[PDB]
Each structure stands twice: as structure tokens, then as C-alpha cells.
Ligand binder design. Structure first.
Ligand code: NI
Length: 341
């Protein structure tokens, strides 16, 4: 049954709650972003109102075939009225089309649901600064102090320099980048840009990217693999067997693969600096794991919450074990005591 942390009190609303069947007394289903754990259960047969960003609405219509009459896209940073309740969508700095939702309840409570986010100081100057928030439903994916990682900018710098060096030394090398959902587009796009190539990909992936309103996308992506030296593959295929196989398919156009797997976190971060990262190599294949995250680090999350000073925090991630839940609640108390709220 629908967990409490997907329900907005004082409304008929749910958030990312599409896998429970008909939620009893839900008059509007919000979807924060197009990732499978959050959209699971949507299809062409869904007949209730879905509220989302324009980009998420493009993906609903074109990838899952949800009918147009049930998609209610809302513009960002704009006061809107839904079943008599004022709401605002804000940029979550997650994947394309991902939002946070501000709800202004009739009784005067103000709730922020972050959906999935990577906290950023830029948020401290949006519509959030203009009023107080009583309840925060928080993306706690990496809510433990061992989760440190570099800025997205330092990681893209490392990838571009690595790729440019490799292909300049060997103009017959192929670069491969893994993907399994929308998000992290900058990795493969920035590499293609420095090399003067388009990114080659499957028809289904090309379709997904064309839903995202990315400026100048017809210039950066293609389905013609033959004309490209940056290929996008499913993440699962980013291993020595999958890559040896792919290289065979290219028919002696290329004699080396440099591949990138942008993971969330990996334990090498506690010990290693981005400058200090090395690939796994076998034969003429090298694989780099790079810590490109689209979730808050522990310190980025902590800053955001200590700025916002909510009266109550409701975690939405890692809530399934008692030891996790208990540890998170202890961090929230430290933060409140340190900041004085
Ligand atoms: Ni997500």
C-alpha cells in the first residue's frame, strides 16, 4: 500500500505513487521526474490527472504513450493552481525535466518535496527564499558523511581531457559511454564536442533525447554509428566482454576502446582525488569509473537543510531499515543543533 511519505497531508495529492493501483482518495498524481522507480505503473491506460514539467510530459506522451488529455505540464518558477491549491515547480538539478514541488496548503502550511535533487547554493536564490517551509520531504540517497564527491565540472574536465588525449595519440580509438536512463547527458555530449564528432546511439535512445528540448541536439546526436567516434551503449554492456563484442561489430574501423561508466558513488572517493583516478585495462580496452552524481553529497544536503531550517524532515530514500532510519534522524538533530533552529 502507498507509503505515508508519498502522500501530501491536507490535499488529495500523491508524489511518484504510480505502482499501488488506485490510491484511495487521490485526486491528482504528481511525477517529479522520468526515472523508472518513480514512474513505475504509468501507461496508455492511466486515466487520472498527472501533473509534471513540460519535459517529463513529452516523455510520458512519446515513450509510455500516456494520453494527452491526462497530461498537465506546468511551467517552472510559476505560481499555479491545482484543485484549489497553489503550487510551484522548481528546478531540482537532477536529470532533464526533474523538479521539486512547493505546496501552499489552505490552512497556511508550506511543504517542499524535493523529488530527487542535487542541492546547490543557486537554490538559495529561487522562490524558496521568499517564505518559510514547515515540512521537507527530502531525497536522502547519500545521507552519510562518507559520501563526498567532486563537482560535476571537475569530473567533466577529467573526462574531456582524458578522451582528447587518447584519440589525439591514437586517431583509430573509439570512445564509449554507458547509460541506462535519462541524466548525465553532459558526459557524452562534452566528450563529442571536444572531439568534433556526433554521439551515435540506438533509435530508441535518440528518440528519448529528442524529447528533452536540449538546444542544438540535432547537431550533437545521430543514429548513424558509422559516422561517429563516440558511441552510447546500455550500461550493462560496459564490461570487457560487451566491449570486445562491440569492437568486432565495427569491422576494423577501430583498434582500441576507451569507455566511461558514470556511476553514483564508489568507495575509491573516500581515498582518491579525481586527478588520481585510473582505468581497468585488458588488451586494447580501458574502462574508467567516474563519480558523476546527480544526487546531493552529504555536505551539499547538510548546507541546504541548515539554510532552509524546516520544522519537520521526512526522508524519502533509505527508509527501509531501522538502522538507516535511526542514523538519518541523528544527523538531522546534529544539523539543527549546530545551526540553532
Ligand atoms: Ni532519479
Amino acid at each position: 500500500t502507498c507509503p505515508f511519505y508519498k502522500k501530501i497531508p491536507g490535499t488529495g495529492f500523491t508524489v511518484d505513487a504510480f505502482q499501488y493501483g488506485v490510491v484511495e482518495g487521490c485526486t491528482a498524481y504528481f511525477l517529479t521526474h522520468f526515472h523508472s522507480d518513480h514512474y513505475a505503473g504509468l501507461s496508455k491506460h492511466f486515466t487520472f490527472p498527472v501533473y509534471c514539467s513540460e519535459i517529463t510530459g513529452n516523455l510520458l506522451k512519446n515513450k509510455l504513450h500516456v494520453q494527452e488529455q491526462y497530461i498537465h505540464p506546468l511551467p517552472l518558477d510559476t505560481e499555479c493552481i491545482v484543485n484549489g491549491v497553489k503550487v510551484v515547480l522548481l528546478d531540482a538539478n537532477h536529470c532533464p525535466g526533474a523538479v521539486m514541488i512547493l505546496f501552499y496548503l489552505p490552512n497556511g502550511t508550506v511543504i517542499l518535496h524535493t523529488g530527487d535533487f542535487r542541492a546547490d547554493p543557486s537554490m538559495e536564490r529561487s522562490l524558496l527564499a521568499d517564505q518559510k517551509v514547515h515540512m521537507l520531504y527530502l531525497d536522502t540517497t547519500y545521507c552519510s558523511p562518507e559520501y563526498t564527491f567532486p563537482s560535476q565540472q571537475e569530473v567533466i574536465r577529467f573526462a574531456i581531457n582524458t578522451a582528447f588525449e587518447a584519440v589525439t595519440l591514437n586517431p583509430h580509438a573509439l570512445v564509449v559511454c554507458g547509460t541506462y536512463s535519462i541524466g548525465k547527458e553532459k558526459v557524452f555530449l562534452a566528450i563529442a564536442d571536444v572531439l568534433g564528432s556526433k554521439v551515435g546511439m540506438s533509435q530508441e535512445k535518440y528518440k528519448t533525447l529528442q524529447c528533452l528540448n536540449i538546444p542544438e541536439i540535432n547537431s550533437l546526436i545521430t543514429t548513424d554509428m558509422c559516422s561517429s567516434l563516440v558511441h552510447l551503449l546500455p550500461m550493462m554492456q560496459i564490461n570487457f566482454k560487451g566491449l570486445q563484442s562491440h569492437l568486432k561489430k565495427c569491422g576494423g574501423k577501430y583498434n582500441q576502446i576507451l569507455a566511461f561508466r558514470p556511476t553514483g558513488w564508489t568507495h575509491s572517493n573516500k581515498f582518491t582525488r579525481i586527478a588520481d583516478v585510473i582505468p581497468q585495462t585488458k588488451g586494447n580496452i580501458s574502462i574508467y569509473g567516474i563519480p558523476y552524481s546527480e544526487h546531493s553529497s552529504y555536505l551539499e544536503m547538510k548546507r541546504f537543510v541548515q539554510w532552509l531550517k524546516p520544522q519537520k524532515i521526512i526522508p524519502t530514500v533509505n527508509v527501509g531499515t531501522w538502522k538507516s532510519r535511526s542514523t538519518m534522524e541523528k544527523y538531522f538533530r546534529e544539523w539543527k543543533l549546530e545551526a540553532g533552529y
